[PDB]
Chain length 237, copies 4
């Protein structure tokens, strides 16, 4: 729904809406046109790991991807997230395919968020961690094509019985409870997220990618957000 901060792992270069001429990681602030990007040395058929950080004192949103016994790529962006996001949010995972496709499979997801004030008597803390997923994950809001398979992996996008990915799917999984990330008299807010993903593709140059995103609590797949908009934005402004 209308408000969106996101870390995007973007397999398919969509040049005319600002994407660099290669797979990339980027930080998206209220738009699909990453405020910052870094080359993403994608490795199809391998398990990748994403770490994401933010601290409201530092005011830096950071992300890393690496694969097992391989190099890593990092992207950063200076952003005060309380001038962007509501004080209460939902956190989620998003993925799409277009004409070109890919599995957008998630193996694990963890998230930690803290909110501190003056008195230690005034604060909150939230943590969740999933290694594989229930067949009816009742603490997840599954949106669009998102489903958990017979292996207990979370499939954000359509995959056939065969084990093979479909074109034109959107999926999203959001954690059930809203997260309190700012408040009038907050001194420090911070969050950390990790996920692991498996992207497989027959295709030359797969599509479209995965995000971790933070949104207003009532968020939903906006109509017309398929493909290159990754399930997040209604247009490409």
């Amino acid at each position: 729904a209308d408000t969106i901060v996101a870390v995007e792992l973007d397999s398919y270069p969509n040049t005319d809406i600002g994407d660099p001429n290669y797979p990339h990681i980027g930080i998206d602030i209220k738009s699909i046109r990453s405020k910052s990007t870094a080359r993403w040395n994608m490795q199809t058929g391998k398990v990748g790991t994403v770490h994401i950080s933010y601290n409201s004192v530092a005011k830096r949103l950071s992300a890393v991807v690496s694969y097992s016994g391989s190099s890593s790529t990092t992207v950063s962006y200076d952003v005060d997230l309380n001038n962007v996001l509501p004080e209460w949010v939902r956190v989620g995972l998003s993925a799409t395919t277009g004409l070109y496709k890919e599995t957008n499979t998630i193996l694990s997801w963890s998230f930690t968020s803290k909110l501190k004030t003056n008195s230690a008597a005034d604060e909150n803390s939230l943590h969740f961690s999933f290694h594989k997923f229930s067949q009816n994950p009742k603490d997840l809001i599954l949106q669009g094509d998102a489903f958990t398979d017979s292996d207990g992996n979370l499939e954000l996008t359509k995959v056939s019985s065969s084990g093979d990915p479909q074109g034109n799917s959107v999926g999203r999984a959001l954690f059930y409870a809203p997260v309190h990330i700012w408040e009038k008299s907050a001194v420090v807010a911070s969050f950390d997220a990790t996920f692991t993903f498996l992207i497989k593709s027959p295709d030359r140059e797969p599509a479209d990618g995965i995000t971790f995103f933070i949104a207003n609590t009532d968020t939903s797949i906006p109509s017309g957000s398929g493909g290159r908009l990754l399930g997040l934005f209604p247009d490409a402004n």
Copy 2:
């Protein structure tokens, strides 16, 4: 009906023969008649602390109550909770007032749950927002101007509950160990010294709600006294 597992602090008269003659802390499995209780030296106008824990290998559910510079009271019950509770639950607090001037104010509440074969949950609150969007408030429950969670009305016979918003995955076939731990602090404010009062941390089915009839000594948790 709801499926209930509770740890309660109870200053009501329990006029049933089995049960005790003083304020007590007790462990409730599916019924208001505590499977196990212990003395509770209930101190009005002082902040109290409850720690509860369970481990599915140890199959021992236990709880402690203390006040600062005070001594504590503990209760345990050997129980296997994966044969009592559904796989997915919601956790919460509840309170009820008698016919006294008294508050049930929650200053803090934390919870951790672990499910190993694969699943972890943790929340922690010190005071509460005016709009606690991650709490499901039931009955007379509201967060006050001070950021304190008032489970009951600030005369008596109020019932109020507060659930954490996400369901908790506490068991599964593939499970080797499930554990949980919870802490809360509370303040009963009252001009009386031994008012009739009840306050609980509880676990239940995810679609749980207040049963009509459940006031006073059924703690907002149960319809019968069975």
Copy 3:
């Protein structure tokens, strides 16, 4: 050193000192003669996982072992650990081999301990987590034959360059910092531990096992504690 609580994973049945007639898990309280045991369905050449719990309110020391896609075994014992242990301890892992042998290899180790009183303003908390190990693990006290190998696995007992285990080794690894587990006005103390282990053996019936143990801070391999005494006790009382 003199005071020892331990969860033992006992591969070799030593009948005449109380061992049951099979591999077992046991809780050892100040003696090698387990206060409680359960049949341990050992699976050589597989990664096993031990979880250990205690809570001073419940007064129950618990442990579980399982392997990957296999059944699990559990043992329990009602013990108030503050009548047994000092208020400050070191936590550790031990292993031995005798004439019969085995690798006693540790892949990960985590430990959490909490101590609460009246006021939340009076408490302590400690947590460590190792997945694989530095070649010079500076936060471990390595005792006897304990070493971290070229794979970053912790080998509590002697293994040849070949990859093959030697007989008559003792090893122990203790975490550097002492742990505060009780105090005059404690309301609740609790700890949790997890480790993963690989036991390989040519032998028919390997020896001798691995423990997780809690001891006085100045603990050390007592002389004459080899073999069946698992690196912990100086005799078999």
Copy 4:
């Protein structure tokens, strides 16, 4: 020499031209001359809170100071700490007094460190034991009858430090992300309003000790003012 990374609270006059004219919070990289500082509204006899964090992807080290019902001051410095600090370190607190009647009492201290490719450490103390065996106390540092950690003497020119006992693994070749976070609360008690005082959280080589000459404004951390 020792290798020092510190966050400091400083009320000494700093008479060197570059440096500031009021009590300040600052980030020290290997020298007493803070790579980055900010105003510190230093409230004597009120409990203060410091939060510090770092992430090796963000390469931004930052800190906040606040008092209850008060507003806060923050400081950041872009730095890569795997080029400044050894791989293994010891973390600690330090304080120094001037020529004033003032305490440097630590009420609480927590620390978390993560090293990912594989390594986690966390400790948390609210008050301290009479015999804090997991702390290495240096110089005038002792735990008092109230369980509070006094870094300096209860006249001035005391220096005192307290290290956490285990070494911390903060970097390695194979490392993808290293992060840490620390919090402490403190109380400077003094009959004066703006006494000359210094209090730090710091990271150093594991064999670190108090350098001679390091009194007052060198915070117990550095031998020179270079």
